Amino acid sequence: MSLDDIINNMIDKLKLLVHFDRISFLLLANETLKLSHVYPKGSHSLDIGSTIPKEQSLYWSALDQRQTIFRSLTDTQDNFYEKQYLAILDLKSILVIPIYSKNKRVGVLSIGRKQQIDWSLDDLAFLEQLTDHLAVSIENVE
Structure with a gap:
């Protein structure tokens, strides 16, 4: 599908899981x-x-x-x-996951929360695995 569809689909899953x-x-x-x-x-x-x-x-x-x-x-x-570009969106916390494949750096995922609630180990492990597959999928578009 398009790069749009790959990202949006990923966002749709995150809504339900994290x-x-x-x-x-x-x-x-x-x-x-x-x-x-x-x-x-x-x-x-x-x-x-x-x-x-x-x-x-x-x-x-x-x-x-x-x-x-x-x-x-x-x-x-x-x-x-x-920072100023995140704070202005009322975010209090940012998690920044670099997206890379076996070959190259692909991009960055930036996840914000309005309330300062710790990231659990389960969520971080889940995100890392999910974004590692994301890097392969993005790379295989181009």
């Missing part, structure tokens, strides 16, 4: 990371297609480290490029 308020998906093409999908449809401060710069970027930090990063958005002493 507590969250906002998700965005970002796509890496040509060493450039771009916002490409947001749920709920209305909720972004950055236009679809915006480029995320590397400097001070939480999303690039996850990609560079090849690690899932969790950040509370209430730490007044912690700024990053994405």
